[PDB]
């Protein structure tokens, strides 16, 4: 029997108080929703790498545990009984039931425990809670607190429970998984995310949040794992003659040292390593433990006798009587130096030993005597090991295995290791070439140690993993995209962007929502699920083109649209000394050794802060004087009360108040702007008041009053519509305008995303500052991120090293921050320049630039302030209704060709009229409407009519 | 007829810092963690650029509300547009676009595809071109209102200070001069590869940056070896960690250098895309009065053509 | 002429330009001619 | 220069002349039209004091 562990098996990773924070940690925890063995019955169970134990109790049946490796008194074993908590570690004799270097003496109940054994310490966490459930473990979450930590030094592999015989229990196992733990206001862990449970949890951990917004995220990577190990060495059975050197009858003099070559053999280096006959065994090349896993192209044994005090000279980087005149090793020497005392072997005195990179300079003798340590003779053997890339002949005692092709394996070729797929190559290696290399200096191909064949090494399949999801506010369902892989290799939908799994493929196209790539988008639709489709580019609409037909609008509407632009960003400033060396003189003195980096950081940030005020002024301060509207507002039916300042309020307009409601100790500070919101509102107020009462003149020079209706007539002529249209339809135009403004309010008050462009700036800068602070917790190789903890524990010689590691990491973090701020500032500056251009061309005048001041024919614009930016309301003229008219390029009268001075000729089926292009208003064709140029024998498409002569 | 070529986008690259620095190596991965969030910052910076690239593309090409098409009977008063309109037999690109497309060409490094494929870009340029030819400037401002092509030109002539009777009296000449000018464009583009150097330069610069980033993996940065596996198979953990830290610092520094340059280059591309988008609205959807903005001489009309990573404008 | 160039190491490479510094005979240098 | 079969088929002596110097600087055996900054002129000492 088994049950669902749900979210049990989480414990406090340490003993530090935290609150209101998401903390990421990796430790041995019970994986979420794993299966645990259900017992009802005292069997011996594996302990593995740690055990999660839980039980339900009613009558104190479950009373203890036994932990050990054999559990039979023949080994060290831990006994815990709870009858009063009693703990003993005697080698106890135990179907045991309950009817030393350490000793301690002091369903309705759920008892949970975590048992893990690390570096000799048996760590016990526990939690007891009330329950009301017989059938199974209750579902829920609670973190377990540390209770006991036993310094026993006892190996635990198996364990057994102890029951009282006159209660079910569960056993799971811990794994090295990553969890994101949520601490509430009182410092209690109230929730947690298991980062390996599923793709949504993986996304939550990646984003450091328990909430995920709508969109596509790159969170992890798909990586194929090796299935077996492949070990290959030459099939040689010869053993290397090391004994012939180390147990040699006689050694040569140091002035005339011997050099023996070792090749074509198996070298067991554990003999020389383990031998207790040596005075020293010092390796400069490789670490001894690993030495036996390698294979060399050759080993040379340099054999000689020197005086004891000279033994220290047999090394790289040395000078001295031997190092300079008798025997020298190169500074990059690779290998091991082995030496031992010969006082009971060579000493007699013995005058056969004389003294004068790898040079044999073929002079005095030493008299070695048994009664002379520094004056005693020593036998020295230097083993020079060549690890150059070449066919190897001297291999350690490692057994080979069979080689497996076209599989993902963990390989070892003569000491060269890696992970990848081995295939047959077509590479023609030269006789002396054992390995090939790629551009990244990785291994491209290898010649097999036993068989003369060349294999290619291709890294095992991998690719990026993206999670596609609607926000967790609506659904916890996700789809997963595997980037650049085949669906046959990893609802399954193959796209050019990767293999998409979990999204239904449908034929219907729609407007793109969450983009995937290569024309494919995803969305959440009906019951609901994630779907994928090829995006639509818009509706299709043909044009009824012919050589004699023109469509002319008969009616129009007034449209008001909103354009939102960033102008400025937060004026931050950072104190590099306080950031790196907050209140610490000892490191401050070392920071000075880096020169002017702090000066440069301060100047860069200051320059940006100043620029922010410049950007603000360029956009808003374009008015010479502060203008105000009259106490009597009569603009011909046009209602501006929702864009003009409200006297009862910072005297902002109604719409500006809406805009302002949608956008929201470490040496880090924030400086205020020069111009406060009140001052910005005065500038927009003046610009608006100026525009309404004086039109375009306040920009060009003096503000010259004009009736509003006449201002509009001017603006209409500017778009090709005769001014009589405005006056005849003045009531309609004013009503369409007033309605359009009301629509703006309904949208802005309900759609927060309307001002996303300004909110994005705020969010990006907030992230940069939070990231900069979080970096202070990094060690960067130091023993601790905290300078005070280093200084209170380490002395000045050592300490300075730990401090330099922190200075470099923290200084690098500041430079990264500043660079990004300068790049972002450039983007803001460009936006501010555009906004300033629009102020002059859209608000102070009238634009003739297509789609510059909104879609349609521009009439006028009104500025509104917003947090860190400006909002423009653009008023445009848009044709609404149209009719099909027959046309002609010219008319024949007396043979003369008549062309319109303005407008086009139109036919209603019986008569020809002339009318303005942007509004149907047919006039009688007369000599005062047309001009004559050329004749009927020249103009193509000319038609016959009668032109009236007044 | 003159040709103006502008970059719109750059390759959407992405780099896996863990695979780049510690490809398949747990021992150094555990040390990389000691540097905090540097990988998070590198990933966000590159992602932001990749997203921007699709934004730039859309701002330039998706300026049409509907997909417009020309009529089955093409009669534009003697003006031959068959070399700029889509060829039904082909990705249905125009003849000239096909010429443009023929001139521009394991380490944790990958490349992401664009949201809009070449086929989708061609549909947008097709709609913009079809719209301009049959409805002039109106499809931009609002509804597409059909107008005879010769009359559209008369409007465009009045806009440069030349009375419309000039167009009609010389309509045959004007159409012939136009048709010849287009043929000249083809002769140049098909033979002069350097004609699209502005787009090729973007491709070359980004290719160099990626190749340089990979080559840096071979550097030792003071270590005994650039290869982590060779360090791990040879040295014990106390010594090894030192050799590894030297490689981590050098490789992490190389990634930061790469990302910084990509952000700076992206800013240049963004500015170019903004200019291209401005020209689309002011040169193609309307008629410009801005000197030398839409080519030398008095602007009449413009036609967009797609190109690899950019847009090409033919200014009349 | 162009004589006096040798493989700098024993690693297989292909389709690549590899930069190396070693003791090589300089191109187009003069060499003593013996017949002695 | 290593060919497809891993044989050195060509080589540039970076100290032979200014064109070879340019080829080495650019890591290519082909040099495009233009002006390149490839090295530095430096006067050497003639005696020790
Ligand atoms: C703790 O004791 C267990 C035995 O209970 C050790 O595991 C054995 O190791 C040997 C040698 O590799 C194997 O042949 C046995 O099969 C293993 N037995 C079991 C049950 O796994 C374990 O290695 C000891 N722990 C330590 C650190 O020495
Ligand atoms: C301009 O429009 C506003 C709408 O916001 C009008 O204000 C409304 O007037 C009616 C009648 O007195 C009140 O019942 C509403 O409560 C008012 N609305 C608000 C938000 O206060 C205003 O009267 C109009 N002014 C002109 C001259 O037309
Ligand atoms: C032009 O369109 C406008 C609407 O945009 C028409 O005005 C509306 O007419 C209806 C009656 O059919 C009224 O109920 C609405 O209240 C009017 N709207 C406004 C804002 O006044 C206008 O009549 C149309 N003109 C022509 C000639 O068709
Ligand atoms: C538009 O111009 C093209 C030139 O590209 C004309 O196509 C040529 O027509 C002639 C006569 O049939 C053929 O011999 C050529 O081979 C065609 N050229 C190509 C590239 O196909 C086309 O006929 C012209 N159309 C109009 C209406 O003038
Ligand atoms: C204006 O210039 C055009 C050329 O750009 C002249 O048209 C050419 O006239 C010659 C005869 O002299 C013909 O051989 C060419 O084929 C014509 N070219 C075209 C495109 O048709 C035009 O005649 C000149 N007009 C005036 C009044 O001088
Ligand atoms: C538990 O066992 C100890 C053994 O020393 C005994 O002294 C104690 O009274 C017992 N307590 C209970 C509740 O049985
Ligand atoms: C913290 O404890 C107090 C009781 O002192 C309680 O009122 C409050 O709700 C607790 N806060 C949380 C987040 O549990
Ligand atoms: C040298 O001889 C001793 C026995 O006195 C032996 O233990 C040792 O392994 C020999 N050394 C070698 C390299 O064989
Ligand atoms: C491996 O063994 C085969 C015999 O099966 C032998 O022919 C071959 O030479 C051996 N390889 C090496 C490198 O010794
Ligand atoms: C998110 O959920 C809340 C319910 O708490 C709902 O009121 C809100 O409208 C939802 N947000 C969106 C964008 O649907
Ligand atoms: C997947 O493999 C099949 C061959 O079985 C091939 O036809 C298809 O194009 C491949 N798709 C991708 C994305 O590689
Ligand atoms: C689209 O419709 C075709 C039939 O015309 C069918 O074969 C195809 O599977 C459909 N695709 C999807 C995603 O429904
Ligand atoms: C003009 O005529 C065409 C063809 O009958 C028709 O599709 C189009 O809707 C008509 N347009 C107007 C404004 O009547
Ligand atoms: C054209 O307009 C005139 C003047 O209003 C009118 O008498 C005539 O009937 C109209 N023709 C048609 C076909 O509607
Ligand atoms: C308009 O097109 C029709 C149909 O092709 C043709 O008969 C007529 O002559 C053309 N008129 C003009 C002025 O081109
Ligand atoms: C216009 O009238 C004249 C007669 O004065 C005639 O010759 C010519 O063909 C007519 N044009 C059209 C288009 O009907
Ligand atoms: C490589 O060798 C093959 C013969 O196996 C030959 O055909 C080919 O041309 C050679 N390639 C080069 C670059 O020399």
PDB file of N, CA and C in Angstrom, chain A residues 641-698:
ATOM      1  N   UNK A 641     -14.517  70.795 -20.622  1.00  0.00           N
ATOM      2  CA  UNK A 641     -14.424  70.783 -19.161  1.00  0.00           C
ATOM      3  C   UNK A 641     -13.717  69.564 -18.586  1.00  0.00           C
ATOM      4  N   UNK A 642     -13.557  68.515 -19.382  1.00  0.00           N
ATOM      5  CA  UNK A 642     -12.924  67.303 -18.893  1.00  0.00           C
ATOM      6  C   UNK A 642     -11.422  67.265 -19.164  1.00  0.00           C
ATOM      7  N   UNK A 643     -10.924  68.246 -19.922  1.00  0.00           N
ATOM      8  CA  UNK A 643      -9.494  68.328 -20.208  1.00  0.00           C
ATOM      9  C   UNK A 643      -8.879  69.580 -19.579  1.00  0.00           C
ATOM     10  N   UNK A 644      -9.731  70.537 -19.209  1.00  0.00           N
ATOM     11  CA  UNK A 644      -9.312  71.741 -18.503  1.00  0.00           C
ATOM     12  C   UNK A 644      -9.175  71.451 -17.004  1.00  0.00           C
ATOM     13  N   UNK A 645      -8.333  72.189 -16.267  1.00  0.00           N
ATOM     14  CA  UNK A 645      -8.111  72.046 -14.838  1.00  0.00           C
ATOM     15  C   UNK A 645      -9.382  72.177 -14.025  1.00  0.00           C
ATOM     16  N   UNK A 646      -9.508  71.341 -12.995  1.00  0.00           N
ATOM     17  CA  UNK A 646     -10.618  71.397 -12.050  1.00  0.00           C
ATOM     18  C   UNK A 646     -10.207  72.225 -10.819  1.00  0.00           C
ATOM     19  N   UNK A 647     -10.760  73.441 -10.624  1.00  0.00           N
ATOM     20  CA  UNK A 647     -10.412  74.394  -9.579  1.00  0.00           C
ATOM     21  C   UNK A 647     -10.494  73.821  -8.167  1.00  0.00           C
ATOM     22  N   UNK A 648     -11.273  72.756  -7.979  1.00  0.00           N
ATOM     23  CA  UNK A 648     -11.428  72.170  -6.643  1.00  0.00           C
ATOM     24  C   UNK A 648     -10.269  71.257  -6.196  1.00  0.00           C
ATOM     25  N   UNK A 649      -9.377  70.868  -7.132  1.00  0.00           N
ATOM     26  CA  UNK A 649      -8.265  69.942  -6.879  1.00  0.00           C
ATOM     27  C   UNK A 649      -6.992  70.708  -6.542  1.00  0.00           C
ATOM     28  N   UNK A 650      -3.118  70.358  -6.198  1.00  0.00           N
ATOM     29  CA  UNK A 650      -2.721  70.143  -7.588  1.00  0.00           C
ATOM     30  C   UNK A 650      -3.975  70.225  -8.479  1.00  0.00           C
ATOM     31  N   UNK A 651      -4.122  71.348  -9.205  1.00  0.00           N
ATOM     32  CA  UNK A 651      -5.288  71.605 -10.049  1.00  0.00           C
ATOM     33  C   UNK A 651      -5.194  70.901 -11.392  1.00  0.00           C
ATOM     34  N   UNK A 652      -5.370  69.593 -11.350  1.00  0.00           N
ATOM     35  CA  UNK A 652      -5.379  68.756 -12.539  1.00  0.00           C
ATOM     36  C   UNK A 652      -6.775  68.698 -13.143  1.00  0.00           C
ATOM     37  N   UNK A 653      -6.849  68.325 -14.413  1.00  0.00           N
ATOM     38  CA  UNK A 653      -8.119  68.082 -15.090  1.00  0.00           C
ATOM     39  C   UNK A 653      -8.683  66.732 -14.684  1.00  0.00           C
ATOM     40  N   UNK A 654      -9.948  66.476 -15.012  1.00  0.00           N
ATOM     41  CA  UNK A 654     -10.554  65.192 -14.675  1.00  0.00           C
ATOM     42  C   UNK A 654      -9.785  64.033 -15.309  1.00  0.00           C
ATOM     43  N   UNK A 655      -9.489  64.140 -16.603  1.00  0.00           N
ATOM     44  CA  UNK A 655      -8.746  63.078 -17.265  1.00  0.00           C
ATOM     45  C   UNK A 655      -7.352  62.891 -16.687  1.00  0.00           C
ATOM     46  N   UNK A 656      -6.641  63.970 -16.384  1.00  0.00           N
ATOM     47  CA  UNK A 656      -5.319  63.797 -15.799  1.00  0.00           C
ATOM     48  C   UNK A 656      -5.402  63.042 -14.477  1.00  0.00           C
ATOM     49  N   UNK A 657      -6.418  63.315 -13.665  1.00  0.00           N
ATOM     50  CA  UNK A 657      -6.554  62.544 -12.434  1.00  0.00           C
ATOM     51  C   UNK A 657      -6.694  61.057 -12.722  1.00  0.00           C
ATOM     52  N   UNK A 658      -7.360  60.699 -13.820  1.00  0.00           N
ATOM     53  CA  UNK A 658      -7.494  59.286 -14.137  1.00  0.00           C
ATOM     54  C   UNK A 658      -6.132  58.697 -14.489  1.00  0.00           C
ATOM     55  N   UNK A 659      -5.334  59.442 -15.250  1.00  0.00           N
ATOM     56  CA  UNK A 659      -4.039  58.943 -15.713  1.00  0.00           C
ATOM     57  C   UNK A 659      -3.111  58.668 -14.529  1.00  0.00           C
ATOM     58  N   UNK A 660      -3.160  59.558 -13.549  1.00  0.00           N
ATOM     59  CA  UNK A 660      -2.328  59.468 -12.358  1.00  0.00           C
ATOM     60  C   UNK A 660      -2.744  58.359 -11.405  1.00  0.00           C
ATOM     61  N   UNK A 661      -3.891  57.732 -11.654  1.00  0.00           N
ATOM     62  CA  UNK A 661      -4.339  56.648 -10.801  1.00  0.00           C
ATOM     63  C   UNK A 661      -4.060  55.288 -11.425  1.00  0.00           C
ATOM     64  N   UNK A 662      -3.460  55.262 -12.618  1.00  0.00           N
ATOM     65  CA  UNK A 662      -3.193  53.978 -13.253  1.00  0.00           C
ATOM     66  C   UNK A 662      -1.718  53.614 -13.207  1.00  0.00           C
ATOM     67  N   UNK A 663      -0.841  54.610 -13.265  1.00  0.00           N
ATOM     68  CA  UNK A 663       0.593  54.315 -13.218  1.00  0.00           C
ATOM     69  C   UNK A 663       1.135  54.504 -11.798  1.00  0.00           C
ATOM     70  N   UNK A 664       1.825  53.473 -11.271  1.00  0.00           N
ATOM     71  CA  UNK A 664       2.365  53.457  -9.909  1.00  0.00           C
ATOM     72  C   UNK A 664       3.857  53.794  -9.943  1.00  0.00           C
ATOM     73  N   UNK A 665      19.493  52.377   2.791  1.00  0.00           N
ATOM     74  CA  UNK A 665      20.461  51.859   3.763  1.00  0.00           C
ATOM     75  C   UNK A 665      21.659  51.141   3.106  1.00  0.00           C
ATOM     76  N   UNK A 666      21.584  50.894   1.788  1.00  0.00           N
ATOM     77  CA  UNK A 666      22.616  50.207   1.001  1.00  0.00           C
ATOM     78  C   UNK A 666      23.372  51.178   0.099  1.00  0.00           C
ATOM     79  N   UNK A 667      23.248  52.471   0.376  1.00  0.00           N
ATOM     80  CA  UNK A 667      23.925  53.496  -0.415  1.00  0.00           C
ATOM     81  C   UNK A 667      23.105  53.926  -1.627  1.00  0.00           C
ATOM     82  N   UNK A 668      21.894  53.405  -1.739  1.00  0.00           N
ATOM     83  CA  UNK A 668      21.022  53.704  -2.871  1.00  0.00           C
ATOM     84  C   UNK A 668      19.978  54.743  -2.509  1.00  0.00           C
ATOM     85  N   UNK A 669      19.899  55.806  -3.302  1.00  0.00           N
ATOM     86  CA  UNK A 669      18.909  56.848  -3.066  1.00  0.00           C
ATOM     87  C   UNK A 669      18.204  57.261  -4.352  1.00  0.00           C
ATOM     88  N   UNK A 670      17.155  58.067  -4.202  1.00  0.00           N
ATOM     89  CA  UNK A 670      16.405  58.622  -5.321  1.00  0.00           C
ATOM     90  C   UNK A 670      16.242  60.125  -5.180  1.00  0.00           C
ATOM     91  N   UNK A 671      16.587  60.860  -6.229  1.00  0.00           N
ATOM     92  CA  UNK A 671      16.484  62.305  -6.197  1.00  0.00           C
ATOM     93  C   UNK A 671      15.161  62.747  -6.822  1.00  0.00           C
ATOM     94  N   UNK A 672      14.536  63.815  -6.323  1.00  0.00           N
ATOM     95  CA  UNK A 672      13.324  64.405  -6.852  1.00  0.00           C
ATOM     96  C   UNK A 672      13.618  65.153  -8.147  1.00  0.00           C
ATOM     97  N   UNK A 673      12.613  65.348  -9.003  1.00  0.00           N
ATOM     98  CA  UNK A 673      12.628  66.146 -10.208  1.00  0.00           C
ATOM     99  C   UNK A 673      12.639  67.612  -9.851  1.00  0.00           C
ATOM    100  N   UNK A 674      13.118  68.450 -10.761  1.00  0.00           N
ATOM    101  CA  UNK A 674      13.055  69.885 -10.538  1.00  0.00           C
ATOM    102  C   UNK A 674      11.632  70.407 -10.621  1.00  0.00           C
ATOM    103  N   UNK A 675      10.868  69.920 -11.589  1.00  0.00           N
ATOM    104  CA  UNK A 675       9.491  70.363 -11.775  1.00  0.00           C
ATOM    105  C   UNK A 675       8.509  69.377 -11.184  1.00  0.00           C
ATOM    106  N   UNK A 676       7.740  69.828 -10.205  1.00  0.00           N
ATOM    107  CA  UNK A 676       6.779  68.980  -9.526  1.00  0.00           C
ATOM    108  C   UNK A 676       5.524  68.813 -10.377  1.00  0.00           C
ATOM    109  N   UNK A 677       4.662  67.867 -10.019  1.00  0.00           N
ATOM    110  CA  UNK A 677       3.451  67.619 -10.789  1.00  0.00           C
ATOM    111  C   UNK A 677       2.608  68.875 -10.937  1.00  0.00           C
ATOM    112  N   UNK A 678       2.593  69.707  -9.901  1.00  0.00           N
ATOM    113  CA  UNK A 678       1.870  70.971  -9.945  1.00  0.00           C
ATOM    114  C   UNK A 678       2.387  71.890 -11.055  1.00  0.00           C
ATOM    115  N   UNK A 679       3.703  71.899 -11.276  1.00  0.00           N
ATOM    116  CA  UNK A 679       4.286  72.778 -12.273  1.00  0.00           C
ATOM    117  C   UNK A 679       4.053  72.236 -13.665  1.00  0.00           C
ATOM    118  N   UNK A 680       4.022  70.919 -13.789  1.00  0.00           N
ATOM    119  CA  UNK A 680       3.781  70.328 -15.088  1.00  0.00           C
ATOM    120  C   UNK A 680       2.342  70.610 -15.490  1.00  0.00           C
ATOM    121  N   UNK A 681       1.424  70.496 -14.535  1.00  0.00           N
ATOM    122  CA  UNK A 681       0.026  70.781 -14.809  1.00  0.00           C
ATOM    123  C   UNK A 681      -0.157  72.226 -15.259  1.00  0.00           C
ATOM    124  N   UNK A 682       0.609  73.163 -14.697  1.00  0.00           N
ATOM    125  CA  UNK A 682       0.490  74.545 -15.142  1.00  0.00           C
ATOM    126  C   UNK A 682       0.931  74.705 -16.584  1.00  0.00           C
ATOM    127  N   UNK A 683       1.966  73.977 -16.993  1.00  0.00           N
ATOM    128  CA  UNK A 683       2.390  74.076 -18.377  1.00  0.00           C
ATOM    129  C   UNK A 683       1.356  73.489 -19.322  1.00  0.00           C
ATOM    130  N   UNK A 684       0.776  72.337 -18.978  1.00  0.00           N
ATOM    131  CA  UNK A 684      -0.213  71.756 -19.875  1.00  0.00           C
ATOM    132  C   UNK A 684      -1.469  72.599 -19.882  1.00  0.00           C
ATOM    133  N   UNK A 685      -1.764  73.237 -18.758  1.00  0.00           N
ATOM    134  CA  UNK A 685      -2.910  74.119 -18.671  1.00  0.00           C
ATOM    135  C   UNK A 685      -2.734  75.314 -19.591  1.00  0.00           C
ATOM    136  N   UNK A 686      -1.549  75.927 -19.568  1.00  0.00           N
ATOM    137  CA  UNK A 686      -1.263  77.066 -20.427  1.00  0.00           C
ATOM    138  C   UNK A 686      -1.310  76.694 -21.896  1.00  0.00           C
ATOM    139  N   UNK A 687      -0.788  75.523 -22.237  1.00  0.00           N
ATOM    140  CA  UNK A 687      -0.777  75.093 -23.624  1.00  0.00           C
ATOM    141  C   UNK A 687      -2.187  74.856 -24.118  1.00  0.00           C
ATOM    142  N   UNK A 688      -3.006  74.249 -23.275  1.00  0.00           N
ATOM    143  CA  UNK A 688      -4.380  73.970 -23.622  1.00  0.00           C
ATOM    144  C   UNK A 688      -5.214  75.238 -23.697  1.00  0.00           C
ATOM    145  N   UNK A 689      -5.060  76.126 -22.718  1.00  0.00           N
ATOM    146  CA  UNK A 689      -5.807  77.373 -22.713  1.00  0.00           C
ATOM    147  C   UNK A 689      -5.431  78.211 -23.916  1.00  0.00           C
ATOM    148  N   UNK A 690      -4.143  78.204 -24.256  1.00  0.00           N
ATOM    149  CA  UNK A 690      -3.635  78.949 -25.389  1.00  0.00           C
ATOM    150  C   UNK A 690      -4.249  78.432 -26.675  1.00  0.00           C
ATOM    151  N   UNK A 691      -4.229  77.118 -26.861  1.00  0.00           N
ATOM    152  CA  UNK A 691      -4.758  76.518 -28.074  1.00  0.00           C
ATOM    153  C   UNK A 691      -6.238  76.821 -28.253  1.00  0.00           C
ATOM    154  N   UNK A 692      -7.014  76.685 -27.193  1.00  0.00           N
ATOM    155  CA  UNK A 692      -8.440  76.888 -27.321  1.00  0.00           C
ATOM    156  C   UNK A 692      -8.797  78.327 -27.680  1.00  0.00           C
ATOM    157  N   UNK A 693      -8.167  79.317 -27.037  1.00  0.00           N
ATOM    158  CA  UNK A 693      -8.546  80.703 -27.300  1.00  0.00           C
ATOM    159  C   UNK A 693      -7.765  81.430 -28.407  1.00  0.00           C
ATOM    160  N   UNK A 694      -6.562  80.963 -28.766  1.00  0.00           N
ATOM    161  CA  UNK A 694      -5.778  81.660 -29.794  1.00  0.00           C
ATOM    162  C   UNK A 694      -5.279  80.754 -30.926  1.00  0.00           C
ATOM    163  N   UNK A 695      -5.660  79.487 -30.909  1.00  0.00           N
ATOM    164  CA  UNK A 695      -5.273  78.580 -31.970  1.00  0.00           C
ATOM    165  C   UNK A 695      -3.773  78.374 -32.096  1.00  0.00           C
ATOM    166  N   UNK A 696      -3.276  78.568 -33.303  1.00  0.00           N
ATOM    167  CA  UNK A 696      -1.882  78.347 -33.653  1.00  0.00           C
ATOM    168  C   UNK A 696      -0.981  79.560 -33.427  1.00  0.00           C
ATOM    169  N   UNK A 697      -1.567  80.690 -33.043  1.00  0.00           N
ATOM    170  CA  UNK A 697      -0.784  81.911 -32.977  1.00  0.00           C
ATOM    171  C   UNK A 697       0.066  82.013 -31.724  1.00  0.00           C
ATOM    172  N   UNK A 698      -0.335  81.358 -30.634  1.00  0.00           N
ATOM    173  CA  UNK A 698       0.442  81.505 -29.406  1.00  0.00           C
ATOM    174  C   UNK A 698       1.789  80.823 -29.566  1.00  0.00           C
TER     175      UNK A 698
END
